Design a binder for this molecule. Structure first.
Ligand SMILES: O=C(NO)C(F)(F)C(F)(F)C(F)(F)C(F)(F)C(F)(F)C(F)(F)C(=O)Nc1ccccc1
Ligand SMILES: O=C(NO)C(F)(F)C(F)(F)C(F)(F)C(F)(F)C(F)(F)C(F)(F)C(=O)Nc1ccccc1
Ligand SMILES: O=C(NO)C(F)(F)C(F)(F)C(F)(F)C(F)(F)C(F)(F)C(F)(F)C(=O)Nc1ccccc1
Ligand SMILES: O=C(NO)C(F)(F)C(F)(F)C(F)(F)C(F)(F)C(F)(F)C(F)(F)C(=O)Nc1ccccc1
Ligand SMILES: [K+]
Ligand SMILES: [K+]
Ligand SMILES: [K+]
Ligand SMILES: [K+]
Ligand SMILES: [K+]
Ligand SMILES: [K+]
Ligand SMILES: [K+]
Ligand SMILES: [K+]
Ligand SMILES: [Zn+2]
Ligand SMILES: [Zn+2]
Ligand SMILES: [Zn+2]
Ligand SMILES: [Zn+2]
Lengths: 369, 369, 371, 371
């Protein structure tokens, strides 16, 4: 049938990103304090508020986040990492999660558990058939956190916690994670590196972040060899490149693999107005990407698809990119993208030779059994 | 000798950009109000504050802005445009300058006059030999405003007001305006379209803004034919492309033309972290661009070079891009770019075939007499 | 017995565009520099809502959707000319001045004004029918300064008067009371019901804080309404002791004398210890005690029918805790401390000063005229 | 005769990192939501500076560069342990807690604390030598809560005491006065000079506003310093009438009795009508009159030697106009109105209430002990 779940929790908007821009404010470096860190939670809150103010919320089934348990977290992460996060969160003013930039406040583990747990709860309810699909608008994000660490503002790897739950608790034999956050999903890649039961795909700007990963030659290991697929694209790639990648690589990979559930790491940092990447995707591009992936799920896994928020750093534009994806889930297309004409004139809608060549990963599809 | 002028006026930081993102907030469109418009003056104020906090201010000669007179403005703009700006500024709550997006507050003409006048005052003092060079950190910007209108948040075309002053008041026969704001300097192009006495050069992202201009075929008209040079570059172009453009096109054009003064429209919206374009220039890239242009001025026009602020929309990073240019003027290189390693890993430092081909404008150099 | 507490929040209450000025607009000639957050910026009320959710109070509330106030609803409190002027201003391509030179609406800003008044109406309807026992409408923009024929003091429509008008005309209640404890005089509400004894209007406020020329004890209504408007102006620096003495000596006796069938509270928190727009010393515990007293009074005299409707309050730091205290008195679930309690308790306001006592006692002889 | 008015602003005064809390840090367990602007955010003082410039007052001032306070400078007001603790905290990779659990410094935040104290010192030196007639040091962080052995109340070092210590030890002045009209008790300054009659310390403040346990009239110094600390605690709601009565009856007579060779004013604007962190009713015209009186007193008794040093004040909207009024009294160029004047004048505070008069009169018998 048709019932679309939606997860927002007030505390997703209360993540304290501090007073720096990216790293902390630093007087010796003359990095002046600023009100809004690049990753400030207001960007995602504005998406939530637009979901409500547009009336999309009336077509969604609100789903309460339920805190991820230690057992849930341990399906994706090491005990040492979980214990370190408990340690850092218990410090009187929080602290450094290990990388020197990713911080948690005192009690910040509460929000990290609710973020991973929002993904799990939506996954559970879609997998059982209570819901047909859904969108978990979580924060903090997940895809940079590998098995043994926090990284890139990610405390736990939300989509991997959800995949682990689908595998262990729901008994699914095959799950796919499709990450279209513009940054390489190195954490997700790491977690399932040796494991063919979770197909991991990352469409991203080549070497945007991290600086040393996301190459096409990173394909997994052992029994997992062939079950990690990176699609690095050049800076300036737009809707044409992204849709060519979907049609030539992503959708064929999903059809070859036959997952029982598709989890999308849904970032909007590939947008035309994002500060933290150089891509040219518009809300109409994300719309088409979502439509294609939802339709693929309908064909191959009884429509079982869960979108989980990753990055995106335009408070101005991200809400409209997100809303387009929500509208593809609900089928209620009731608000225009007010930037559409303005951004459409900038380009990205022609498949350039260098973009085409980057996508033409195609010979690796044959190794997905 | 060596004396570097620097213009900042408090009111440059008081430009009211409203409560929208780009266009105004709009309830029917569900464009939620936001504290900082993309063009909020804090970005440029943070540059000023870094100039001070870094100690660069101790190596600069502060120059007070002096309001541009009607006569000054009329060297670049029509009487109808000036009168319309006086009209709009006199409205009790200001209003629409004509394009439906560019607004002035009540009394906002004061700031527009100080912005153009900051460029004029620095130009005067460099041309006389009181100063060797300088940087006018003005706001609002100028380069989109054509002869008969305000456009793209530009009320008056600051660099053209300064060029007009150099021509009419100082009696210079040849002036060059080099615009490296990432958006096409359509206003400047328009003003001097028929005029070979002001060479206008625009290095920009192709079709970023405006959507219908900046093509290589836009070359001026009449006696001005050959004295407008557009260098449109593809999205994703970085330091390699920008420096190749400098070496192959911009610097040869300046040497062919033999201006008596070089005015640089110094935007930083080509930076790696800018939301309003897709280019990959780092602070080190802007440093090298500035070094090259200052050295060219030393060779061909007795060092007479005036930098005038155009766009740039990263409050995080613009200050460091600007500071690099200031350091090239003063010769005091006392602060690192704290983002250098982070951004250097993202690329843009290899000249791609498509970038090289866009630059290879070279056959037009022969028409500069 | 029955317990179900309604709660109204609409996303658009947080989207009210207060501009780039502090109070009036930014002004270059006056050298009033633009600022991100106007004093009345919606974030203050949004932070209250978010605390209601993050504290877990939301799990004890029954969410009630705001329904846009119709023209008919608005016309029970305001003139046709005022409604038409608001439709006119809201239809202007970039909105404009609502009449006073400071209160503005955006293009389409009438949508939010309707949802604000309509949130009060919807909660009133559902409490009056017995679906709900009581509730809190966390609306924005506020209401109490808007008189019959105008917008004023960032109020477009007089939300509590629209709700009272609905209770009177649609539900057929013969007597309604509006108790306003916003720190500013409820001049709009006073104006609307000035000649009308069917809506008892009470305003507890800082004397001459805003507006400058109203809220005196001598403003008592007119005609058949004479005696059915009660102002309790208090001196600057009044705190919990003064506010509770006013409740016990004046407000609660007035309500008991009048026997309203519904009590509507204009629930502002601008009397708080940390508010920039008044000089009063009320703490979250003070508002808690005020709410408790008023809810208990409603239980005694009108079958518990009480509707709280948000008015002002300008501390984004502290207002959420003041508001949460009132919500907790409605739900009976007292699960979070006021983290400012010790800090503010040391500042005073907890002793009834002679001047405060005397200001309150000025109103006591007027209670006898409430029939 | 001579007229040259020094003015200190340093960009880094605007870069003080006040964090993401309201007052204490953001706290998830307490459900204190993060906020962009802490109550003490530097933008309030930066907006004052920008108004000094945009109003054209800057053209009538002599800009004076702040020079970092040396260890020797700091040690005239504070203990070696406190200085070493501040060097320790500032050297920590991400800074930390200065001791009280709320006052923090960033890594390298000692640089700004030194520039703040050093701005006061540099202006003091240049006024005392006769290079300047008077001046205003618009410093941040503030000073007056920091006692000899600690940081407190967002004060790292006691700027005015560092300046007084310099005047005493380096310039050889035998008598200095510090007049603090920040609305909070200058407990730090009181502590530093408690036993010392060579620095007369006066604090006009809201009674028990902050700290909670100090500022009583009975706190008069000790030993040879007995009689050389004067507290003037005023009740909440006191306005221009009370403040000017306190100036005329207590402050100015105390200064005339003491005959300081230099007057340092701890110039806070947190007594303003719109301040969130106190309940007083002073307007820009009130601060203007206070400044005029004090400058004229300096002209009469110490050859015009007066240095104003910024303390608190938490209205980004209104503080700039309060500060500008003081600057205009120094320059004598009165070129911009207070655009809030009419709005605030209607709220009151301009009548001397009996309780206000009595609070002030409590201090008058202590004037006789100033020898
Ligand atoms: O959306 C993001 N990723 O999907 C993002 F994490 F926020 C990021 F990639 F854009 C990021 F901002 F670049 C980053 F990863 F968070 C980051 F900035 F790169 C970082 F992680 F914070 C970071 O800079 N990490 C470093 C760690 C060690 C040494 C240098 C950098
Ligand atoms: O830095 C800039 N230019 O150098 C910029 F003007 F700010 C811009 F190009 F980035 C801009 F923001 F895109 C813009 F030009 F200002 C703008 F947004 F495009 C605009 F001018 F405001 C704009 O959108 N103008 C339009 C006018 C009519 C119809 C549609 C758009
Ligand atoms: O909470 C408030 N009222 O309950 C308040 F309206 F916000 C106010 F009273 F505090 C207010 F802010 F003071 C005001 F009422 F909004 C205002 F500021 F006074 C005003 F209404 F906007 C205002 O200043 N109005 C004026 C109208 C005409 C002439 C001068 C002032
Ligand atoms: O302007 C001020 N003083 O002149 C002020 F310091 F900011 C203050 F008094 F208003 C203050 F904000 F109240 C404070 F002093 F800063 C403070 F908030 F009270 C505090 F110091 F930070 C504070 O609350 N300190 C405490 C220390 C220990 C235990 C409880 C509170
Ligand atoms: K895998
Ligand atoms: K990815
Ligand atoms: K030309
Ligand atoms: K350009
Ligand atoms: K009445
Ligand atoms: K009231
Ligand atoms: K003393
Ligand atoms: K004081
Ligand atoms: Zn990302
Ligand atoms: Zn630009
Ligand atoms: Zn109010
Ligand atoms: Zn203070």
């Amino acid at each position: 049938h048709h019932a679309i779940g939606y997860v927002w929790n007030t505390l997703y908007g209360w993540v304290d990103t501090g007073t720096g821009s990216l790293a902390a404010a630093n007087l010796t470096a003359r990095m002046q304090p600023i009100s809004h860190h690049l990753a400030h939670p207001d960007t995602k809150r504005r998406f939530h508020e637009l979901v409500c103010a547009s009336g999309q919320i009336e077509h969604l089934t609100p789903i309460a986040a339920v805190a991820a348990t230690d057992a849930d977290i341990l399906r994706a992460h090491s005990a040492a990492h979980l214990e370190n996060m408990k340690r850092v969160s218990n410090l009187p003013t929080g602290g450094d999660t290990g990388d020197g930039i990713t911080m948690m406040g005192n009690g910040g583990l509460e929000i990290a558990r609710l973020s991973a747990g929002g993904a799990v709860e939506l996954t559970r309810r879609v997998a059982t058939g209570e819901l047909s699909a859904g969108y978990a608008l979580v924060n903090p994000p997940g895809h940079h956190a590998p098995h043994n660490a926090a990284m890139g503002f990610c405390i736990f790897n939300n989509t991997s916690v959800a995949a682990g739950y689908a595998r262990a608790v729901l008994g699914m034999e095959r799950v796919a994670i499709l990450d279209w956050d513009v940054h390489h999903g190195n954490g997700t890649q790491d977690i399932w590196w040796n494991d063919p039961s979770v197909l991991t795909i990352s469409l991203h700007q080549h070497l945007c972040f991290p600086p040393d990963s996301g190459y096409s030659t990173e394909r997994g290991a052992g029994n997992g060899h062939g079950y990690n697929i990176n699609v690095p694209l050049p800076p300036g790639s737009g809707n044409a490149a992204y849709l060519h990648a979907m049609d030539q690589v992503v959708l064929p990979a999903l059809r070859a693999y036959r997952p029982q559930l598709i989890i999308v790491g849904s970032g909007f940092d590939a947008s035309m107005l994002d500060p933290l990447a150089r891509m040219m995707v518009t809300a109409d591009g994300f719309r088409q990407m979502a439509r294609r992936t939802i339709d693929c799920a309908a064909d191959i896994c009884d429509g079982r698809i869960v979108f989980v928020q990753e990055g995106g750093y335009s408070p101005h534009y991200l809400p409209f990119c997100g809303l387009a994806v929500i509208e593809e889930l609900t089928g209620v297309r009731s608000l225009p993208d007010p930037y559409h004409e303005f951004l459409a004139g900038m380009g990205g809608n022609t498949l350039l030779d260098a973009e085409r060549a980057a996508i033409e990963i195609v010979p690796l599809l044959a190794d997905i059994r």
